[PDB]
Design a protein around this ligand. Sequence first.
Ligand code: K
Ligand code: K
Ligand code: K
Ligand code: K
Ligand code: K
Ligand code: K
Ligand code: K
Ligand code: K
Lengths: 162, 162, 162, 162, 162, 163, 163, 162, 163, 163
Amino acid sequence: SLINTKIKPFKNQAFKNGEFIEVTEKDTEGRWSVFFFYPADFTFVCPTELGDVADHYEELQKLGVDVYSVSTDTHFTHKAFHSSSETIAKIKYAMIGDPTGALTRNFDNMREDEGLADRATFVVDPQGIIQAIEVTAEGIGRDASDLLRKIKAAQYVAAHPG
Amino acid sequence: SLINTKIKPFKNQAFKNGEFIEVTEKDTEGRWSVFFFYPADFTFVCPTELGDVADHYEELQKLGVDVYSVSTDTHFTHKAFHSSSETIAKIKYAMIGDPTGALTRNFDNMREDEGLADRATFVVDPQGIIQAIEVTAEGIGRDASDLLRKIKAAQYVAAHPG
Amino acid sequence: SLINTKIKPFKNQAFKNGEFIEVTEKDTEGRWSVFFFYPADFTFVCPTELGDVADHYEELQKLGVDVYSVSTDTHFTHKAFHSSSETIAKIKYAMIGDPTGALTRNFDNMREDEGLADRATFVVDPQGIIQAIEVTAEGIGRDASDLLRKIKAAQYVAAHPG
Amino acid sequence: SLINTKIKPFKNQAFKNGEFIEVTEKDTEGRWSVFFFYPADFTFVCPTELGDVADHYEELQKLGVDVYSVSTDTHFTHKAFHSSSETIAKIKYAMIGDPTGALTRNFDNMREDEGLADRATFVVDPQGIIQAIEVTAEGIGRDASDLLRKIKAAQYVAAHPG
Amino acid sequence: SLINTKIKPFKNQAFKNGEFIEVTEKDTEGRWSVFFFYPADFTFVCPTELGDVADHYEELQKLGVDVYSVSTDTHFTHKAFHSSSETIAKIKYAMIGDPTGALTRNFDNMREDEGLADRATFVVDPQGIIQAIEVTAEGIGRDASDLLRKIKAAQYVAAHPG
Amino acid sequence: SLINTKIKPFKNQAFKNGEFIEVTEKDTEGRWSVFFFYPADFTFVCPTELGDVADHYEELQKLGVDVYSVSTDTHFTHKAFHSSSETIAKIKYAMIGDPTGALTRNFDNMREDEGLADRATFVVDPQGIIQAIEVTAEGIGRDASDLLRKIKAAQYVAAHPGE
Amino acid sequence: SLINTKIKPFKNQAFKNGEFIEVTEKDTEGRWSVFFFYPADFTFVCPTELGDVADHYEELQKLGVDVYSVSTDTHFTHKAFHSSSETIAKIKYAMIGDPTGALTRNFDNMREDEGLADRATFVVDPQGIIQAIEVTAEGIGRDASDLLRKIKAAQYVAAHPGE
Amino acid sequence: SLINTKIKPFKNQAFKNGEFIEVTEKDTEGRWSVFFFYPADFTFVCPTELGDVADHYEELQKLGVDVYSVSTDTHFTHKAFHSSSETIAKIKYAMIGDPTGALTRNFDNMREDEGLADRATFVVDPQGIIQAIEVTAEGIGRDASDLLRKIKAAQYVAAHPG
Amino acid sequence: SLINTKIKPFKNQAFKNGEFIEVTEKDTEGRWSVFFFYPADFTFVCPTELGDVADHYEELQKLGVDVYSVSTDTHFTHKAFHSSSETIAKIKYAMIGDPTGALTRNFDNMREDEGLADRATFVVDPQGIIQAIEVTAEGIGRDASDLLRKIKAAQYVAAHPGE
Amino acid sequence: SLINTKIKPFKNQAFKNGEFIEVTEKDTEGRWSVFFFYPADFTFVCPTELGDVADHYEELQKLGVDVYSVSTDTHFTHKAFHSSSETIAKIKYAMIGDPTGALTRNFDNMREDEGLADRATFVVDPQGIIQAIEVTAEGIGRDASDLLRKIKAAQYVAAHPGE
Ligand SMILES: [K+]
Ligand SMILES: [K+]
Ligand SMILES: [K+]
Ligand SMILES: [K+]
Ligand SMILES: [K+]
Ligand SMILES: [K+]
Ligand SMILES: [K+]
Ligand SMILES: [K+]
């Protein structure tokens, strides 16, 4: 698995709070990052997973943990989605667009048959190291509370080596 | 270029008139087909390049021509789009979603560095042989008026050789 | 990721209830199997992870779920470990020894520079399709309760498609 | 396709207004250039596709656009041709001879099985970046009228971005 | 050299006495053939060489010897040339067009830099065997009388082996 | 065979008298080393081979010989075994853990289909040259005394060239 | 190592009891064989090893063990060697000549820079499986007694799986 | 063909006027050289070709033209042949022996299945550029007079470009 | 060396007593053949080697031995040489022309930088097996008598195995 | 063939006059050398060839020619062979042992399926250039007289270019 590997550089357009920004691997340096991949915007799956994460975003920011949602949709497309479903509107974190699929493949998370990302979550430490990975098949939901638990523990071991 | 080639096989999801269908190379069928590629849904140029084609779509069945718009967004993404712009609401032809980019690359029409299709239009005759090609950079619109041009008598030469 | 792939073949020896047995992919066919990897036996990191899973074993067996713990240690070491830690003594599921590291490499779960497996968990359905993956660096525990959640969830989707 | 690429270097002989010159990629110059490809000289469709372009040539310097017709015949062959058809006599732009087919293949525009160029027209801006492409099978003529189309404001977007 | 090798198959369009025909390698079977390559039609070199051959064409036909002029020009192009210079008008033999260069390269006679054939003459016997080759640089003329001399001698040895 | 070759570099974790150590080829320079391989800790075979070596360890240390027992188990596993067993508690020499098999593989001594080392012993001189190799299938024990003999000889020839 | 492997096929000439014979792998089947390699005949770096083995030879023989000495010399050289030394003269088991080095390479026991075999001993059971290997540098003698031991041990385990 | 290429390097022994000498490409530099290949010495085909060339030797020397006959025979055989046939005795030019066939293979003039040179003639200018090639099957003689014609012709063009 | 190998197939043109013949390996089957190589015809070295062979040819033909002289010249050239020379006019055996060098190259006997054969002689038995090879630099003549001796021996051993 | 080539470098052990020595290519420089290969010592397919060469040895010696016999046996085997046969006992030139077969392969003179050298003789001039080669199958003896002849002939041509 990619556990304990360094994420590789990337440059994508993303959507974060009414504006279009650019995220690259430098921006993740010095920070804790959570990459939340999902297959696609505007799908009939209830977006609860992206929103569930939104709910913990204030505590995540408080812990110095940044968040990035990712789909092979364009960033233009994330916006429409953010401003259309009330649940999706709770997102204040960056919503990265990866239409080239480059980011998704960097994390070896592509459903190569469908051109969409698998439902995977990655926890990356300040050094660019992947410290926790979770991937699930369509229908198996990710509970943001457990992600958070891993994250505090992850942060802890960096600080208390034993 | 692909002028005069037989189109290659494909299976993409698409949206047509309220709910979702499949398109394959055979659905093109013994008909004249128009593949109208465009970069992406929801961007800010309002694209009724697409809408003009829609306006002229009724007249496009004319001849037994199907019109297929194509972008690297998903079909989920195209509908959401048919519902946001009234100008886009005008579309009665198939909006094909090509998330894997395979359809786009079949027509050698991918902006590989962006993961989006280029502004290219293709005219395909009933045995699937491409009879006309037009490609432009963004900002240079395509007129359906004589996109309609001239399918022509492409018609004719094909039914009155020379 | 290995998501949605069918697991590969293996034949390994294991300690399960006081006895040495052999395990193969065939023993998993038709059942839900959970493959729980860990670095090594007799280490000083507490097997709270393994015992927690054992506590829920009564419960995994109800859903028709098999549990296989895996380390690059021998089944012999597993027999020994099962007799020294009271937390480990509780294990009623199979402890697979993968001294050749082949089973571990099957799930691409090897730390090659150490010769030990990563803290990885896999949920495999009766058709041998991996439906869930969870991997963590040491110090970042895997929550057994949450594991159970995913499995029940995995089971629904499987009996009630979308 | 070649949409948006930098043209590759070339040196071909050509005919212009009574006697023979050289064209290289640099003669394109900080100007808008039009490469008008056609199959061959002296065939029997009378081609004033070429002549229309000639008719509209005066207006084509307009903007500082050069017009270059291209076929796999030699420059010797193009002149003989300027002298046989009064309609062809109308041409004041460069008729490039491309016997080696290198110019044609630079624009990926060769009918490899015939050794003739396809009916393709290309618009190149002053730094040599292709901004527009149109290709058709024989029998489907190209209208200079809006070949002139729209060079456009290709002009504009380039001098008024977006 | 290609002396004593069998010519390889080909299919070109050619011009012979007011009409457009097709020549292939089958047509040369059972006959003596002379392939007279030249660089290009409508050049400022005096076409005396093609015409000089015309002068001996009646005797060549009388001896069962066919003739083929060849250039990378199209056959359309040979016509214009045949009906424009009084010297070129003497040709009653086929004037093959090889715009793909395939024939010329079959005889390894291409000026690869210029896309034109070298000034070479080939004598091919009824079995497809090359029996006499002559190639010269621009400006060195081929005297048809000597070609004829070689040809009778060539025909003779086939008949009188010694 | 590997006879008369220089041992290759290695870095392994090990157990030696209650503590974890690192062992590398550099740790062998200038000394006589015995690399004592065995399949695995905690198996059902009685460990007389390891123990027999321990019995002669004192005497080997006088001759300036280091002993490294080696299996593909981890050092963690050696810790456990060293406490749990009878005879192994007698072990005061280094127990090297080779989970990656590189040490074992260095000596061409891996049972690849098993992921375990063969029952093999090697005598290595101060320059890292292997002077004696002994390998046997299970049930055929290695005699520590014969090992010592060979070692004495190895040291002799080495200190008195050409006889 | 070649431990626990089946010997590869061979066809060699040999000196046996005043006579020249052919030996092949088919000739080892069903028997316990000891392949005793040595550098060369007529060295006189001590030929104690060949002679020592000769002394334990019928004890080896009616444990049902055959002994084959092997060097890269010819069988011709072996009879000659057998006729000059009272110690070598004592050898009554087969002395295989391996001029091509094929047997030696079979047991991967060749010193390539010298063109001679190493001081290696191999024990092969009736199934052609190598159960024991002993290799030493020149000067480090091989103990016949320890060989005998190993062979008996090998035979036991082989007839009594689980002790 | 080898037309217009610079000849390759060679060092061969030869018979020239009663003496054995060595010949290299350097001995040709700055001169017009004619390389006359033939199958073999002492054959029964009459060297009328060689003697005819000798008759014109007086004359080749006037134009500053060197003559080198070449066969895969040795210079030794050439000495012998020069003394047996009165027609051959006339040879005052160099008879190069190419026993290794390398010189012959340089001009790609070898009949590989026979180990002999083809009846080939080459005209090389002072800069080492081959300006004329004539090759024939046996029985088809090369005309020396015609050779001379080409050489004079070759010389003009060289002193009066186009 | 090519000693004890089967000659490879060949087809060459040749001169033999005024006529042109083809010679192939098939023409050698069942006979003893001597392939006598030399650099070239018409050179400045006196041809005693070819002539010496001719002198013994009669006698070789009684022993059932065929002689093929070989150079990379053509058969045409051999014709010439056979008439022009002294001693070569004495030649009644086949003079093979090898302009392509395949025969010469068959016997590994080509001076590649010269395009000529080395002064080499080969004795080949009825089964196409080379039994004797002799090669010398210029100035060191090959003695036909010694050739005969060798041939007699070759025939002997061949008709009376194992002495 | 290797005719007219320079010998490749070598370092071998040998038996010489009751003593063991080293011979290398540097030891042939400036002298005429005869490399006399033979299958093996102690065969007794006739050792006439080695003895015959010994008889012509000082005639060879004060033409300034050195003689080196070569077999794939060891030098050890050669002294032994030199002590048993009155005919071999007569050899006073160096007997090179080539256990590795390197010298033999240098002269491309090895019988690979047997591990022994062929009956080949080579003449090397002071510049290390092979001027003469003679190879024969077993049973076809090599004539010492003809060797001597060739050597004198070789030396002449070498000192008198053009005769
Ligand atoms: K996409
Ligand atoms: K292990
Ligand atoms: K052309
Ligand atoms: K010591
Ligand atoms: K040997
Ligand atoms: K030749
Ligand atoms: K006979
Ligand atoms: K030997």
